[PDB]
Coordinates of C-alpha atoms in Angstrom, one line a residue:
Chain A
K35 CA 21.0 222.8 50.1
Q36 CA 18.8 220.6 52.2
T37 CA 19.7 220.0 55.9
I38 CA 19.9 216.7 57.8
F39 CA 19.8 216.0 61.5
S40 CA 21.0 212.6 62.9
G41 CA 20.4 212.0 66.6
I42 CA 23.0 209.5 67.7
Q43 CA 22.7 207.7 71.0
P44 CA 25.9 207.3 73.0
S45 CA 25.4 203.6 73.7
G46 CA 28.9 202.3 74.2
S47 CA 30.2 200.8 71.0
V48 CA 29.3 200.5 67.3
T49 CA 29.1 197.3 65.5
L50 CA 30.4 196.9 61.9
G51 CA 26.8 196.3 60.9
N52 CA 25.6 199.7 62.2
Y53 CA 28.7 201.5 60.8
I54 CA 27.6 200.2 57.3
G55 CA 23.9 200.9 57.9
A56 CA 24.0 204.5 59.1
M57 CA 27.4 205.8 60.0
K58 CA 29.1 205.4 56.6
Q59 CA 26.0 206.4 54.6
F60 CA 25.4 209.7 56.4
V61 CA 29.0 210.7 57.0
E62 CA 29.5 210.8 53.3
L63 CA 26.6 213.1 52.6
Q64 CA 28.5 215.8 54.6
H65 CA 29.5 217.7 51.4
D66 CA 26.1 217.6 49.5
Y67 CA 23.9 218.2 52.6
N68 CA 24.2 220.5 55.5
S69 CA 24.6 217.9 58.3
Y70 CA 24.4 217.7 62.0
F71 CA 25.4 214.8 64.3
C72 CA 24.1 215.3 67.8
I73 CA 25.2 213.0 70.6
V74 CA 21.9 212.9 72.5
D75 CA 23.1 212.5 76.0
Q76 CA 19.9 214.1 77.4
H77 CA 18.0 211.2 75.9
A78 CA 20.5 208.7 77.3
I79 CA 19.5 209.6 80.9
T80 CA 15.9 208.4 80.2
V81 CA 17.3 204.9 81.1
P82 CA 19.6 203.9 84.0
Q83 CA 23.2 205.0 83.4
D84 CA 26.5 204.9 85.2
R85 CA 27.7 208.5 85.2
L86 CA 31.2 207.2 84.2
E87 CA 30.0 204.9 81.5
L88 CA 28.0 207.9 80.0
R89 CA 30.9 210.4 79.8
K90 CA 33.0 207.6 78.5
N91 CA 30.5 206.6 75.7
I92 CA 30.0 210.3 74.7
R93 CA 33.7 210.9 74.1
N94 CA 34.1 207.6 72.5
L95 CA 31.3 208.0 70.0
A96 CA 32.6 211.5 69.1
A97 CA 36.0 210.1 68.4
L98 CA 34.7 207.4 66.1
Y99 CA 32.6 209.7 64.1
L100 CA 35.6 211.8 63.3
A101 CA 37.8 208.7 62.9
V102 CA 35.4 207.4 60.2
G103 CA 36.0 210.5 58.1
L104 CA 33.5 213.1 59.4
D105 CA 35.0 216.5 58.7
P106 CA 34.3 218.9 61.6
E107 CA 34.8 221.9 59.4
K108 CA 32.0 220.9 57.0
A109 CA 29.6 219.0 59.4
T110 CA 28.4 219.8 62.9
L111 CA 29.2 217.3 65.6
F112 CA 28.1 218.3 69.1
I113 CA 26.7 217.2 72.4
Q114 CA 23.0 217.9 73.0
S115 CA 23.5 218.8 76.6
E116 CA 26.0 221.6 75.7
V117 CA 23.2 223.4 73.6
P118 CA 20.7 224.6 76.2
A119 CA 18.2 225.5 73.5
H120 CA 17.3 221.8 73.3
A121 CA 15.8 221.7 76.8
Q122 CA 14.3 225.1 76.3
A123 CA 12.5 224.4 73.0
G124 CA 12.0 220.9 74.4
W125 CA 9.9 222.4 77.1
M126 CA 7.8 224.7 74.7
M127 CA 7.0 221.5 72.7
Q128 CA 5.8 219.8 75.9
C129 CA 3.2 222.6 76.0
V130 CA 2.0 221.7 72.5
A131 CA 2.2 217.9 72.7
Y132 CA -0.7 216.0 74.4
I133 CA -0.4 213.1 76.7
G134 CA -2.6 210.8 74.6
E135 CA -0.2 211.0 71.6
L136 CA 2.7 210.2 74.0
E137 CA 1.1 207.2 75.8
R138 CA 0.5 205.6 72.4
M139 CA 4.1 204.4 71.7
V153 CA 10.1 207.5 84.9
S154 CA 8.8 210.7 83.3
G155 CA 11.5 211.5 80.7
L156 CA 10.8 208.1 79.1
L157 CA 7.2 209.1 78.4
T158 CA 8.0 212.7 77.4
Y159 CA 11.3 212.8 75.3
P160 CA 9.5 212.8 71.9
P161 CA 8.7 216.6 72.2
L162 CA 12.4 217.1 73.1
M163 CA 13.3 214.9 70.1
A164 CA 10.9 217.0 67.9
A165 CA 12.8 220.0 69.4
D166 CA 16.2 218.4 68.5
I167 CA 15.3 218.2 64.8
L168 CA 13.2 221.4 64.5
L169 CA 15.7 223.8 66.1
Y170 CA 17.9 223.4 63.0
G171 CA 15.4 223.9 60.2
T172 CA 15.9 220.2 59.4
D173 CA 14.7 219.1 56.0
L174 CA 15.7 215.4 56.4
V175 CA 16.2 212.8 59.2
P176 CA 17.7 209.2 58.9
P177 CA 15.8 206.0 59.2
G178 CA 16.8 204.9 62.7
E179 CA 14.9 201.6 63.0
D180 CA 11.8 202.5 65.2
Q181 CA 11.7 206.2 64.2
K182 CA 8.7 205.7 62.0
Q183 CA 6.3 207.0 64.8
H184 CA 8.8 209.4 66.3
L185 CA 9.1 211.4 63.1
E186 CA 5.2 211.3 62.7
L187 CA 4.8 213.1 66.0
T188 CA 7.6 215.4 65.2
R189 CA 5.9 216.3 61.9
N190 CA 2.5 216.8 63.6
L191 CA 3.9 218.9 66.4
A192 CA 5.7 221.0 63.8
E193 CA 2.4 221.5 62.0
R194 CA 0.5 222.2 65.3
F195 CA 2.9 225.0 66.2
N196 CA 3.0 226.5 62.8
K197 CA -0.9 226.8 62.8
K198 CA -1.1 228.1 66.3
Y199 CA 1.7 230.6 66.5
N200 CA 3.8 231.1 63.4
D201 CA 5.0 229.1 60.5
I202 CA 8.7 228.8 61.6
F203 CA 9.3 225.0 61.3
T204 CA 10.0 223.2 58.1
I205 CA 8.4 219.8 58.1
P206 CA 11.1 217.1 58.2
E207 CA 11.2 214.1 55.9
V208 CA 12.9 210.7 56.3
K209 CA 15.1 209.9 53.3
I210 CA 17.2 206.8 52.9
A215 CA 22.9 196.6 53.1
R216 CA 21.9 194.9 56.3
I217 CA 24.8 193.2 58.0
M218 CA 23.9 189.9 59.7
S219 CA 25.6 188.0 62.5
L220 CA 28.8 186.1 61.8
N221 CA 27.6 183.3 64.2
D222 CA 24.0 183.4 62.9
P223 CA 23.3 184.7 59.4
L224 CA 19.6 185.1 60.1
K225 CA 20.1 187.3 63.1
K226 CA 21.1 190.9 62.6
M227 CA 24.6 191.9 63.9
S228 CA 24.1 193.6 67.3
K229 CA 26.3 194.7 70.1
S230 CA 24.0 193.1 72.7
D231 CA 24.4 189.7 71.1
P232 CA 25.5 187.4 74.0
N233 CA 28.1 185.6 71.8
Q234 CA 31.1 188.0 71.2
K235 CA 31.8 186.3 67.9
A236 CA 28.4 187.3 66.4
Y237 CA 29.7 190.9 65.9
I238 CA 32.7 193.0 65.0
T239 CA 33.3 196.4 66.7
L240 CA 35.3 199.1 64.9
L241 CA 37.9 199.0 67.7
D242 CA 38.4 195.2 67.5
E243 CA 42.1 194.4 67.4
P244 CA 43.5 192.8 64.2
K245 CA 44.2 189.4 66.0
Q246 CA 40.6 189.2 67.2
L247 CA 39.1 190.7 64.0
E248 CA 40.7 187.8 62.1
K249 CA 39.5 185.1 64.5
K250 CA 35.8 186.2 64.3
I251 CA 35.9 186.1 60.5
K252 CA 37.5 182.7 60.1
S253 CA 35.0 181.1 62.4
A254 CA 32.1 182.9 60.8
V255 CA 29.4 180.2 60.0
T256 CA 29.2 179.2 56.4
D257 CA 28.1 176.4 54.1
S258 CA 30.0 173.3 52.8
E259 CA 29.3 174.0 49.0
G260 CA 32.8 175.4 48.8
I261 CA 31.8 178.0 46.2
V262 CA 31.9 181.7 47.0
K263 CA 28.5 182.7 45.4
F264 CA 25.6 184.8 46.6
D265 CA 21.9 183.9 47.5
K266 CA 20.5 185.3 50.7
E267 CA 17.8 182.7 51.5
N268 CA 20.0 179.7 50.4
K269 CA 23.6 180.6 51.6
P270 CA 23.0 183.3 54.2
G271 CA 26.4 183.2 55.9
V272 CA 28.5 183.2 52.8
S273 CA 26.2 185.8 51.2
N274 CA 26.6 188.1 54.2
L275 CA 30.4 187.8 54.1
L276 CA 30.3 188.7 50.3
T277 CA 28.3 191.9 51.3
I278 CA 30.8 192.9 54.0
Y279 CA 33.7 192.2 51.6
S280 CA 31.8 194.3 49.0
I281 CA 31.4 197.5 51.0
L282 CA 34.7 197.6 52.8
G283 CA 36.7 196.5 49.7
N284 CA 35.0 198.9 47.3
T285 CA 33.9 196.3 44.8
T286 CA 30.7 194.7 43.7
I287 CA 29.6 191.2 44.9
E288 CA 29.6 189.8 41.4
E289 CA 33.2 190.9 40.8
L290 CA 34.1 189.0 43.9
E291 CA 32.3 185.9 42.7
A292 CA 34.4 186.2 39.5
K293 CA 37.5 186.6 41.8
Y294 CA 36.9 183.5 43.9
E295 CA 36.0 181.2 41.0
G296 CA 38.5 178.6 41.7
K297 CA 38.6 178.9 45.4
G298 CA 37.2 178.0 48.8
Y299 CA 36.1 179.7 52.0
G300 CA 39.6 179.4 53.6
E301 CA 41.4 181.7 51.2
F302 CA 38.3 183.9 51.0
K303 CA 37.9 184.2 54.8
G304 CA 41.6 184.8 55.1
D305 CA 41.5 187.5 52.4
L306 CA 38.4 189.1 53.9
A307 CA 40.1 189.1 57.3
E308 CA 42.9 191.3 55.8
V309 CA 40.6 193.6 53.9
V310 CA 38.8 194.2 57.2
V311 CA 42.0 194.8 59.1
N312 CA 43.0 197.3 56.4
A313 CA 39.7 199.0 56.3
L314 CA 39.7 199.4 60.2
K315 CA 43.4 200.3 60.7
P316 CA 43.2 204.0 59.7
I317 CA 40.0 204.3 61.7
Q318 CA 41.6 202.8 64.8
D319 CA 44.9 204.6 64.3
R320 CA 42.9 207.8 64.3
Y321 CA 40.5 207.0 67.2
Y322 CA 43.4 206.7 69.6
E323 CA 45.1 209.9 68.4
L324 CA 41.8 211.7 69.2
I325 CA 40.5 209.9 72.3
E326 CA 43.5 211.1 74.3
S327 CA 44.1 214.5 72.6
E328 CA 42.5 217.7 73.5
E329 CA 42.0 218.4 69.8
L330 CA 38.9 216.3 70.4
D331 CA 37.6 218.8 72.9
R332 CA 38.3 221.7 70.5
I333 CA 36.3 220.1 67.8
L334 CA 33.4 219.5 70.3
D335 CA 33.7 223.1 71.6
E336 CA 33.5 224.4 68.0
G337 CA 30.5 222.2 67.3
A338 CA 28.6 223.4 70.3
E339 CA 29.3 227.0 69.4
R340 CA 27.9 226.5 65.9
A341 CA 24.8 224.7 67.1
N342 CA 24.1 227.3 69.8
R343 CA 24.5 230.2 67.4
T344 CA 21.8 228.5 65.1
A345 CA 19.6 226.9 67.8
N346 CA 19.3 230.2 69.6
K347 CA 17.9 232.0 66.6
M348 CA 15.2 229.4 66.2
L349 CA 14.6 229.5 69.9
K350 CA 14.0 233.3 70.1
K351 CA 11.4 232.9 67.4
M352 CA 9.7 230.1 69.3
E353 CA 9.8 232.3 72.4
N354 CA 8.4 235.3 70.5
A355 CA 5.8 233.1 68.9
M356 CA 4.6 232.0 72.3
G357 CA 5.4 235.1 74.3
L358 CA 8.0 234.1 77.0
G359 CA 10.2 237.2 77.6
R360 CA 10.7 240.6 76.0
Chain B
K35 CA 21.3 233.5 106.1
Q36 CA 18.2 231.6 104.8
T37 CA 17.1 231.9 101.2
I38 CA 13.5 231.9 100.1
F39 CA 12.3 231.1 96.6
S40 CA 9.0 232.6 95.6
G41 CA 7.6 231.4 92.2
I42 CA 5.1 234.0 91.0
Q43 CA 2.7 233.5 88.1
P44 CA 2.2 236.2 85.5
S45 CA -1.7 236.1 85.4
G46 CA -2.6 239.6 84.5
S47 CA -4.0 241.2 87.6
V48 CA -3.3 241.2 91.3
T49 CA -6.0 241.6 93.9
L50 CA -5.7 243.3 97.3
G51 CA -5.9 239.8 98.9
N52 CA -2.6 239.0 97.1
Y53 CA -0.7 242.1 98.1
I54 CA -1.6 241.5 101.8
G55 CA -1.4 237.7 101.5
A56 CA 1.8 236.9 99.6
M57 CA 3.5 239.9 98.1
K58 CA 3.6 242.3 101.1
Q59 CA 4.6 239.6 103.5
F60 CA 7.4 238.1 101.4
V61 CA 8.8 241.3 100.1
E62 CA 9.2 242.2 103.8
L63 CA 11.4 239.2 104.4
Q64 CA 13.6 240.8 101.8
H65 CA 16.3 242.1 104.3
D66 CA 16.3 239.0 106.7
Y67 CA 16.5 236.5 103.8
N68 CA 18.1 236.2 100.5
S69 CA 14.9 236.0 98.6
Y70 CA 14.2 235.2 95.0
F71 CA 11.0 236.2 93.1
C72 CA 10.9 234.3 89.9
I73 CA 8.2 235.2 87.2
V74 CA 7.3 231.7 86.1
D75 CA 6.3 232.3 82.4
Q76 CA 7.3 228.7 81.4
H77 CA 4.7 227.5 83.9
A78 CA 2.2 229.9 82.4
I79 CA 2.4 228.2 79.0
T80 CA 1.0 224.9 80.5
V81 CA -2.5 226.5 80.0
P82 CA -3.7 228.5 77.0
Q83 CA -2.4 232.0 76.6
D84 CA -2.4 235.0 74.2
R85 CA 1.3 235.8 73.5
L86 CA 0.4 239.5 73.7
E87 CA -1.3 239.5 77.2
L88 CA 1.4 237.1 78.6
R89 CA 4.2 239.4 77.5
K90 CA 2.2 242.2 79.1
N91 CA 1.5 240.5 82.3
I92 CA 5.2 239.5 82.7
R93 CA 6.1 243.3 82.8
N94 CA 3.0 244.1 84.8
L95 CA 4.1 241.7 87.6
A96 CA 7.7 242.8 87.5
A97 CA 6.5 246.4 87.8
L98 CA 4.1 245.7 90.6
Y99 CA 6.6 243.9 92.8
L100 CA 9.0 246.8 92.5
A101 CA 6.1 249.2 93.0
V102 CA 5.4 247.4 96.3
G103 CA 8.9 247.9 97.8
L104 CA 11.0 245.0 96.4
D105 CA 14.6 246.1 96.4
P106 CA 16.5 244.9 93.3
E107 CA 19.7 245.3 95.4
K108 CA 18.5 242.9 98.1
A109 CA 16.2 240.5 96.2
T110 CA 16.5 238.9 92.9
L111 CA 13.6 239.5 90.6
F112 CA 13.8 237.7 87.3
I113 CA 12.0 235.9 84.5
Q114 CA 12.2 232.0 84.5
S115 CA 12.7 231.6 80.7
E116 CA 15.5 234.1 80.8
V117 CA 17.6 231.6 82.9
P118 CA 18.0 228.4 80.8
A119 CA 19.2 226.2 83.7
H120 CA 15.6 225.9 84.7
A121 CA 14.7 224.0 81.5
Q122 CA 17.9 222.0 81.7
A123 CA 17.6 220.9 85.4
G124 CA 13.9 220.4 84.9
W125 CA 14.6 217.9 82.2
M126 CA 17.1 216.1 84.5
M127 CA 14.4 216.1 87.2
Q128 CA 12.0 214.4 84.7
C129 CA 14.5 211.6 84.5
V130 CA 14.2 211.2 88.3
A131 CA 10.4 211.6 88.7
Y132 CA 8.1 208.6 88.0
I133 CA 4.8 209.0 86.1
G134 CA 2.6 207.9 89.0
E135 CA 3.5 210.5 91.6
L136 CA 2.8 213.0 88.7
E137 CA -0.4 211.2 87.7
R138 CA -1.7 211.7 91.3
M139 CA -2.3 215.5 91.2
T140 CA -4.3 216.6 88.0
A151 CA -6.1 214.4 75.9
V152 CA -4.5 217.2 77.9
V153 CA -1.3 219.1 77.2
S154 CA 1.9 217.3 78.5
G155 CA 3.6 220.1 80.3
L156 CA 0.5 220.5 82.6
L157 CA 1.1 217.0 84.0
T158 CA 4.9 217.2 83.8
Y159 CA 5.6 220.7 85.2
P160 CA 6.1 219.6 88.9
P161 CA 9.7 218.4 88.3
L162 CA 10.3 221.8 86.7
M163 CA 8.9 223.4 89.8
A164 CA 11.3 221.2 91.8
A165 CA 14.1 222.3 89.5
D166 CA 13.1 225.9 90.1
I167 CA 13.5 225.8 93.8
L168 CA 16.4 223.3 94.2
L169 CA 18.5 225.2 91.7
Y170 CA 19.1 228.0 94.3
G171 CA 19.7 225.9 97.4
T172 CA 16.4 227.3 98.6
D173 CA 15.8 226.7 102.3
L174 CA 12.2 227.9 102.4
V175 CA 9.2 228.4 100.1
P176 CA 5.9 230.3 100.5
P177 CA 2.7 228.4 101.0
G178 CA 0.3 228.6 98.1
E179 CA -3.3 227.4 97.6
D180 CA -2.4 223.8 96.5
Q181 CA 1.4 223.9 96.9
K182 CA 1.3 221.3 99.7
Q183 CA 1.2 218.3 97.4
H184 CA 3.6 220.1 95.1
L185 CA 6.2 220.7 97.8
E186 CA 6.0 217.1 99.0
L187 CA 7.1 215.9 95.5
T188 CA 9.9 218.4 95.4
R189 CA 11.3 217.1 98.7
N190 CA 11.1 213.5 97.4
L191 CA 12.9 214.4 94.2
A192 CA 15.5 216.4 96.2
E193 CA 16.1 213.4 98.5
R194 CA 15.9 210.8 95.8
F195 CA 18.6 212.6 93.8
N196 CA 20.9 213.4 96.8
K197 CA 20.9 209.8 97.6
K198 CA 21.3 208.3 94.2
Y199 CA 23.8 210.6 92.4
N200 CA 25.6 213.1 94.8
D201 CA 24.3 215.1 97.8
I202 CA 23.9 218.6 96.6
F203 CA 20.2 219.7 97.1
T204 CA 19.1 221.3 100.4
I205 CA 15.6 220.0 101.4
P206 CA 13.1 222.9 101.5
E207 CA 10.4 223.7 104.0
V208 CA 7.2 225.8 103.9
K209 CA 7.7 229.1 105.8
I210 CA 4.5 230.5 107.4
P211 CA 4.5 234.4 107.3
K212 CA 3.3 236.7 110.1
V213 CA -0.3 235.5 110.2
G214 CA -1.2 236.6 106.7
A215 CA -4.8 237.7 106.7
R216 CA -7.1 236.0 104.2
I217 CA -9.0 238.8 102.5
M218 CA -12.5 238.0 101.3
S219 CA -14.9 239.4 98.7
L220 CA -16.5 242.8 99.2
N221 CA -19.5 241.1 97.7
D222 CA -19.8 237.6 99.2
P223 CA -17.7 237.6 102.3
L224 CA -17.6 233.7 102.6
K225 CA -15.8 233.6 99.2
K226 CA -12.1 234.4 98.9
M227 CA -11.2 237.6 96.9
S228 CA -10.7 236.7 93.2
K229 CA -10.0 238.5 90.0
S230 CA -12.0 235.9 88.1
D231 CA -15.2 236.9 89.9
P232 CA -17.7 238.1 87.2
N233 CA -18.8 241.1 89.4
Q234 CA -15.9 243.6 89.4
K235 CA -17.4 245.0 92.7
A236 CA -16.2 241.9 94.6
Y237 CA -12.5 242.5 94.1
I238 CA -10.0 245.3 94.3
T239 CA -6.8 245.3 92.2
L240 CA -3.8 247.5 93.0
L241 CA -4.3 249.5 89.8
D242 CA -7.9 250.4 90.4
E243 CA -8.3 254.2 90.3
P244 CA -9.2 256.0 93.5
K245 CA -12.6 256.6 91.9
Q246 CA -13.3 252.9 91.4
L247 CA -11.6 252.2 94.7
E248 CA -14.1 254.5 96.3
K249 CA -17.1 253.2 94.5
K250 CA -16.4 249.5 95.4
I251 CA -15.8 250.1 99.1
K252 CA -19.0 252.0 99.7
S253 CA -21.0 249.2 98.1
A254 CA -19.2 246.4 100.0
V255 CA -21.5 243.9 101.7
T256 CA -22.1 244.5 105.5
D257 CA -24.7 243.5 108.1
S258 CA -28.0 245.1 109.4
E259 CA -26.5 245.9 112.8
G260 CA -24.7 249.2 112.3
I261 CA -22.0 248.3 114.8
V262 CA -18.4 248.3 113.7
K263 CA -17.4 245.2 115.7
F264 CA -15.2 242.4 114.5
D265 CA -16.5 238.8 114.7
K266 CA -15.7 236.6 111.8
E267 CA -18.5 234.0 111.9
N268 CA -21.5 236.4 112.4
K269 CA -20.2 239.6 110.8
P270 CA -18.0 238.6 107.9
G271 CA -18.5 241.6 105.6
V272 CA -17.6 244.0 108.4
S273 CA -14.7 242.1 109.9
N274 CA -13.1 241.6 106.4
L275 CA -13.2 245.4 106.0
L276 CA -11.8 245.9 109.5
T277 CA -9.0 243.5 108.6
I278 CA -8.3 245.6 105.4
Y279 CA -8.5 248.8 107.4
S280 CA -6.1 247.3 110.0
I281 CA -3.4 246.3 107.5
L282 CA -3.4 249.2 105.1
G283 CA -4.1 251.4 108.2
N284 CA -1.4 250.3 110.5
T285 CA -3.8 250.3 113.4
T286 CA -5.2 247.4 115.6
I287 CA -8.7 246.2 115.2
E288 CA -9.2 247.2 118.9
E289 CA -8.3 250.8 118.2
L290 CA -10.7 250.7 115.2
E291 CA -13.6 249.4 117.5
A292 CA -12.6 252.2 119.9
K293 CA -12.2 254.7 117.0
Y294 CA -15.6 253.7 115.5
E295 CA -17.6 253.4 118.8
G296 CA -20.7 255.5 118.4
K297 CA -20.4 255.5 114.6
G298 CA -22.1 253.6 111.8
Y299 CA -21.1 252.1 108.4
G300 CA -21.4 255.4 106.6
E301 CA -18.1 257.0 107.6
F302 CA -16.5 253.7 108.3
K303 CA -16.6 253.0 104.5
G304 CA -15.8 256.6 103.7
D305 CA -12.7 256.7 105.9
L306 CA -11.6 253.2 104.9
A307 CA -11.9 254.3 101.2
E308 CA -9.5 257.2 101.7
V309 CA -7.2 254.9 103.7
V310 CA -7.1 252.4 100.7
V311 CA -6.6 255.2 98.2
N312 CA -3.7 256.6 100.2
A313 CA -2.1 253.1 100.6
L314 CA -2.4 252.4 96.9
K315 CA -1.3 255.8 95.6
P316 CA 2.5 255.5 96.0
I317 CA 2.2 252.0 94.5
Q318 CA 0.4 253.4 91.5
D319 CA 2.6 256.4 90.9
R320 CA 5.6 254.1 91.1
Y321 CA 4.1 251.4 89.0
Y322 CA 3.3 254.0 86.3
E323 CA 6.9 255.2 86.2
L324 CA 8.5 251.7 85.8
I325 CA 6.0 250.1 83.4
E326 CA 7.0 252.4 80.5
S327 CA 10.7 253.1 81.4
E328 CA 13.7 251.1 80.4
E329 CA 15.0 251.2 84.0
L330 CA 12.7 248.2 84.5
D331 CA 14.4 246.3 81.7
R332 CA 17.7 247.0 83.3
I333 CA 16.5 245.6 86.7
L334 CA 15.3 242.4 84.9
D335 CA 18.6 242.1 83.1
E336 CA 20.5 242.3 86.4
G337 CA 18.3 239.7 88.1
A338 CA 18.6 237.3 85.2
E339 CA 22.3 237.7 85.4
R340 CA 22.5 237.1 89.1
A341 CA 20.2 234.1 88.8
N342 CA 22.2 232.6 85.9
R343 CA 25.5 232.8 87.7
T344 CA 24.0 231.0 90.7
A345 CA 21.9 228.5 88.8
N346 CA 24.6 227.5 86.4
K347 CA 26.9 226.4 89.3
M348 CA 24.3 224.0 90.6
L349 CA 23.5 222.9 87.1
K350 CA 27.2 221.9 86.6
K351 CA 26.9 219.8 89.8
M352 CA 23.8 218.0 88.6
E353 CA 25.5 217.3 85.2
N354 CA 28.6 215.9 86.8
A355 CA 26.4 213.9 89.1
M356 CA 24.6 212.3 86.1
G357 CA 27.3 212.1 83.4
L358 CA 26.1 214.7 80.8
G359 CA 28.7 216.5 78.7
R360 CA 32.4 216.6 79.8

């Protein structure tokens, strides 16, 4: 059973687009793969942060992950910061990484990649996700892994990166993104039904009046068919067949409700957890698991380098 | 009342200049200060090492400090890596330090440029009031004070701002060999230095062949008679006698017995240290003392760590 590590930044709120990109894809692999989801709060402080926004974002993200079906008794969801081994191994890896490598991509900004390498390597990670802009982060990680294996002990497995792009409702050519100035460009998983509906019905389209798919010729309608597709558990072409004698108004109206119904259980559950202390227990349990495992790999690192006794 | 934090490198061998310079002086402040002696193995790995000799030096240093009169009941002696908060706080301090101030001190290994915030973390973690002076610790301490103040201001106010404490005129001890040089273990001539574990026989050999003058007067003046005044300084401190008594004592006498007598004085000073070192170095009582100190340090350090985390928004 291969093992996967996903480093997940607590950055406030998840768009539908990114839920469909990563979240959904990797949450489902929890039964076939041994899977870790690490809220990387120590990487978040490499940029300016309000202390309150940060604790808020961390809880919030944890709640969503569980709300979207992550099973804490099969996968390991935890907060980086609560597993001291990360900083510890993070520091040993600083003593193996060179500056040159790091300048080629505030101090923690320049020197978090060794800590990132440490995040993945502490767990014997076989696989990492394709976070857009991780192509050079994984390369370093791989390299640092190889450099430590040669110089001390083969203890690290060399991690691999093994694999629907949701575009803006306002502009089909732009990717859906939380930082989009226009609030109607994107849907967040906690959007209320009322507002969910509004954003879909005003989503830019064509005039052709025919629900059909081609990306570079009907990008707005194509995108909508792709959302409908994933959230509704159907194929695009079935949907074409289904809207044969129909126009965008019925389509947009039906899609609205599909989306409301796909997000209702997720919301319902978010709010049960966000307030509960059950959420804290889950996170306590996750940190215990990760420490138990991360500490074994740490001691080896320490023994490989010679740090105690 | 005041607490001192002494960060001490496990480098494999300690000269006489060190015992009299740092160790002795700061192990004496033991009762009038809550004093920490931290074996900084995570600073050690910024430069190349053999995992065997590093492990060895770590014990060696622990054993030496005890052997020299460090009281595990009054001072906290511990290993840096064995208290995780250092790594944790250190990482937090990297998120406060800018690259420039770090770039203004030293493809090279990253932890060699980025250790100063970890040094900051080491000290600030204990609410340290005072620190020893080191060779090039001036520029290091200045950065720590900045990071302390920068963080007090921006997040919460939790760090005390530390100060260099100057000990009771620590004597700088010079080579036996070239008296203008400072005593150093790296010198390629083992005659030039004396280490606390030198056998009485090698102690004796080295002292007799220590560089002097062509006068044959045992008289202290630093600029014209550096060999002799270095030895007088050594005789003074291990002797517990003033240089004046030693000029009195060695009036109508020449370098012959001056070196003979000093030799026996050094042997006798180093004997208890050696007998005691050789008990601890093999026994498990040492391990017990290093477990206690790690425990004490962790309890203190973890409280401050919680404050830093609350102050920045990590965890819950």
